[PDB]
Every structure is written in structure tokens, then in C-alpha cells.
A and B are shown apart, each in its own frame.
Chain A
Amino acid sequence: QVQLVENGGGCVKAGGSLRLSCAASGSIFSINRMTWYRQAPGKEREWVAAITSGGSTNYADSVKGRFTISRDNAENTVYLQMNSLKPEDTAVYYCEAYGTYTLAPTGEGEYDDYWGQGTQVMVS
């Protein structure tokens, strides 16, 4: 199957920036929708940003302008550039690989959704 491993999360001062990266391991041919979620302490999961294979993007109103989602097609890796960070942004950020088509050269594959592990983001 597939591992989503997020990185780029660290303690940061308000007004500062991070770039979160989620790498997708395995025999990936394509990912339909890749979506960034975050889980603030004692809040429900919040939808942040999404990118289609094709590079069409969308953002929660709470982050439009500040955050930018992008893809390295070569590496099955998506990025969340976060600028003008606020305490409200303090959360564990994980990615969803919706409609993930995997396939070995043997012709055996899978179509499934995968969830990352999370990267901790702390804004002072």
C-alpha cells in the first residue's frame, strides 16, 4: 500500500512562515484529490486546502491568501506554504490521498484513500 509522511512542522513565532511537505510512498500512478487537514487542540478537524491531479486548488476562507498548496508531480509530494501564521493555526497537519491508484509492473494494484500521520505546528 501507501504511507503519507508529513514534514516541515515546527514551533514558530506569529507572523512567520513554514512549508509543510507530505511525501506519498509506494507504487503510486496517480492521486485524484490531495487535501490538507488540521486538528487544533479540542476542535473538530478543519479542511485547509486541496489540489486535484491537474493542479486546481481551493482554500478555507481562514487561510486564503496566506497558505498556498502545490505539487511536485515527479515525487508524489504536496506542499503547504504557510505565511503570516497566527496562534489559531496551531494544529497537527495531515494529508488525505483521495482516489490513490497504485500498480506494480506485475499488473497488481489498488484504488484506495490514504491518511497521513501528522506534523505538529506550534504558533506562539
Chain B
Amino acid sequence: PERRVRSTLKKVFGFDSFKTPLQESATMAVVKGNKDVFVCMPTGAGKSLCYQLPALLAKGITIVVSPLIALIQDQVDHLLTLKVRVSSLNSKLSAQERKELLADLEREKPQTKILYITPEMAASSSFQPTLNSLVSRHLLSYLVVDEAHCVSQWGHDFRPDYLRLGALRSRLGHAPCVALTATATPQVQEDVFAALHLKKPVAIFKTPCFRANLFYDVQFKELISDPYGNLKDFCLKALGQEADKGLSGCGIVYCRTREACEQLAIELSCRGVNAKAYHAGLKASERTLVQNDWMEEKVPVIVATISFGMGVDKANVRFVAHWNIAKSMAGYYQESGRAGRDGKPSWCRLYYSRNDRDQVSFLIRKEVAKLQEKRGNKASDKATIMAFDALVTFCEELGCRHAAIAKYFGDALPACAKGCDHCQNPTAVRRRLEALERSS
């Protein structure tokens, strides 16, 4: 049973082991085939294998619903390299290729083992009789819904087409349904379980957010006499973890505006921590050179706009400081998460001010208004604002920082080992929050 999976994992996919025990558990739950399965794992965590490997071990065919043809083509190309009998039914096909594939699907024992299809195609009149005979001959082993968050108006990429999939899942009652995505809050997950008609109990495999080696804190700029000086000492502590070597590792400072970038770089450089600005304002050549200087550790600190952001990863980022609050919890998570990739201790600090909150609050309304003029209203618009309010709440509440990140994304209470300001000294955080209330 576990041997069949290991055998196929090697002989077909050419892997000695699963990337993670979570990927393994997901894969085994799909193989057993007794439950609907929800897989929520970031890009690169091997989500695809969690349905592709079980598809090869089942007796019948696996249908994979994916929302655009670019995405479909990605895995078809890869599975073909593996000598897997994959097909795609889409309109980027000759009328002849379409008919050849529909004919294959009418066979007792189709050549096709895995079929990739758009939600458009899965509903189209052309396909219904094919789908019906696949049902009738009990040839469907799995229905897979990729990008399952697209069914939710509260996710970032709602698609009406996805609303038909619950009906499809119901008709394919014989077969287990696997739904996958990189991105789902608890509300998006509840929408996925309801709108796709997933059968309870739904087995869930969700990669935790929690980063044990990241120390999170929020500082209130309004309560600090020398903000720039506070930031410099933060940089010094974080870059000072091997004093013998001198300066060790690197850091990112995130800012809202190009001006603030340029200015923060000058202020830091003055105070003894060499920092260079990286933003859309610079010539392409200047950006390549600044990024290079950071990558090769000529310059230890890079100051970037949240808007332009960072194009490249680095293993020894010892700190990420948000000078200005980010636009969303997800943005903050991703930007701060550039820290500590090598697994060594790193520091993530958010410099909060109600003045910054109000600036961003309003800019978000403006960018939402601009989208509403060009394409009308959308429940995503409310999502964008709540995504920011979650981060404001993170800044203004007392409570474990890792716990607040976990709660937003729908993870279990994480094991913070005095790994944030509130868990290290609850009273000091309370002190600072009480002080911020007085400045109101």
C-alpha cells in the first residue's frame, strides 16, 4: 500500500522521498480514496503530486479542472516528460485533436489516464455526452479542482465558471474530489467546501505559516524620540550575531514611497549602517547594480518600496524592517518571510503609526475605487480592505504575533518559544500599547 506509492514515487516521478510528511499524508489520504481532500500548500511544495501520483495508482481516469490554459499546459508538458498518458481538452486544439481525444475517452480502457480541462469545457455542450459515458462506465477515479479558491468571491481571483463545479462534483458522486490551492483563509476554505459540495469528513492538508526562527515585534514610531536611530540599532543587533566576523548577513527595509526609501537609506548610511535605495524610480542599470551589491554583500542593507518590492531571494537575510505598514497581512507575511531562509535566527519588525495606517487605509480605497470604475463592484473589494484591517489589528492588539498570523491564515495555534515581543515580555508590550492610547 505505502510500497505501491513509494514504488511509483521513484519509478515514475523519480523521487526517493516526499518533500514533507504533510505532502506524504495528503498523497496517502487521496490514494485511500474514501474522502474528499483539501490541499493548501505554497507554490513549490509538490501539491500536484498529491493527485497525479494517486491518479496513476487508481483503476480509472482522473479529470483535473484548472482555470486557465497556461496553468494546464505547465503540468501536461511536465507529465509528458515522465511518459505519463496525460491529455488536455481545450480550444487551443485542432478540431481533429479534440475529436481524437473525445474518441479516446469513449473507449473501454482509454489511453488517457489524466485529463486536464477548463471549467468552460467541463460545462460545454460538446463534452456532456463524453462526461456522461465516463460516469456510466464508472471510469472516473478522481475529480480534481485546481485553483479551488477561484470558487470564492472572498478570494483574490473569483471565477463564475467555478460555480458550476459543485454541480459537477455532485454528478461525480461515485468519485472522490481533491481541491487544491496555495491561498485560502478560513472564509475561502468554507466557501471551497460548500461551493464544490465536498463530502464531510473533508481531509485537510494545509502548510502552516509559522516560522520558528523569525522574531516578530511591532514598534510605535509615535512613542520613539529617534526613530531612525531605533532602526539603526535594530539593524546592528540583527547584523551582529557573529561579532568576530564583524557585520554578518543582510537586511531589507520596506517603505511606502521612493522619497522615504531614498531618505531612510541616507539616514541609515549616516548613522553607520550602509543602505541603498531600490525602487521603480531608478534606471534598470541602477537597480541591477544595487541588487547585485546587496546579493554580494558589498552593501548590507537594501531599502525597497512595498509597491516595487524585491525581485530576488537570499539565504542570510537577518532582518526585515517595515518602516511603513504593508498593504495586507499576506503582503506582510511574504515580505517579512524573505528573512531567515537559512533557518538561523532573524528579526521581523513592523514600525507602526496611526498616521501610516490612515495613509494606507486611504490609498487602498483609491486603488479599489479605480478598479470599480473600470470593471464594476466585487466582494474582493471588501476582501482587500479586510486584508489590511487584519494587519492593523496585528499592530494594535496584545497577543502572540505568530498566533495572530496563524489565526488570519487558518492555522493551529503555533509553538512560539518566546519567539515574538508579546511572548518574550507581555507587560512591556501592554506598557507600549497603553502609551499609544495616551497619544490618541
Interface residues of A (CB under 8 A from B): 1, 27, 29-30, 32, 99, 101, 103-113
Contacts and interface: CB of A to CB of B under 8 A. Distances in A.
A105 B208 contact: yes
21 contacts: A27-B412, A29-B186, A29-B410, A99-B193, A103-B410, A103-B411, A103-B412, A104-B412, A106-B21, A106-B22, A107-B22, A107-B206, A108-B22, A108-B203, A108-B205, A109-B206, A110-B201, A111-B200, A111-B202, A112-B200, A112-B202
Contacts of A1: 201
B68 interface: no
A7 B21 CA distance: 39
B206 A111 contact: no
Given A106-B21, A108-B25, A29 B412 contact: yes
Contact of A110 (B21, B190, B204): B204
Q: How large is the interface on B (under 10, 10 to 19, 20 to 34, 35 or more residues)?
A: 20 to 34
A107 B186 contact: no
B234 interface: no
Interface of B: 21-22, 25, 38, 186, 189-190, 193, 198, 200-208, 210, 410-415
Contact of B207 (A104, A107, A111): A107
A1 B210 CA distance: 23
Among all A-B residue pairs, the 4 with the closest Cβ atoms: A109-B204, A111-B202, A112-B201, A105-B412
A111 B202 CA distance: 5
B186 A105 contact: no
B206 A103 contact: yes
A110 B412 CA distance: 12
Contacts, number: 62
Contact of B413 (A99, A105, A109): A105
Nearest to B192: A111
B206 to A, nearest CB: 5
A101 B21 CA distance: 21
A112 to B, nearest CB: 4
B185 to A, nearest CB: 11
A107 B205 contact: yes
Given A29-B186, A111-B193, A105 B411 contact: yes
A32 B190 CA distance: 9
Given A29-B412, A110-B203, A111-B204, A101 B186 contact: yes
A106 B415 CA distance: 11
A101 B412 CA distance: 10
B353 to A, nearest CB: 30
A99 B204 contact: no
B404 to A, nearest CB: 14
Contact of A30 (B186, B198, B208): B186
Nearest to B36: A111
B408 to A, nearest CB: 12
A104 B190 CA distance: 18
A53 to B, nearest CB: 10
B157 to A, nearest CB: 22
A105 B201 contact: no
A109 B25 CA distance: 11
A111 B198 contact: yes
Contacts of B201: 1, 110-112
A25 to B, nearest CB: 15
Most buried by A among B206, B414, B415: B206
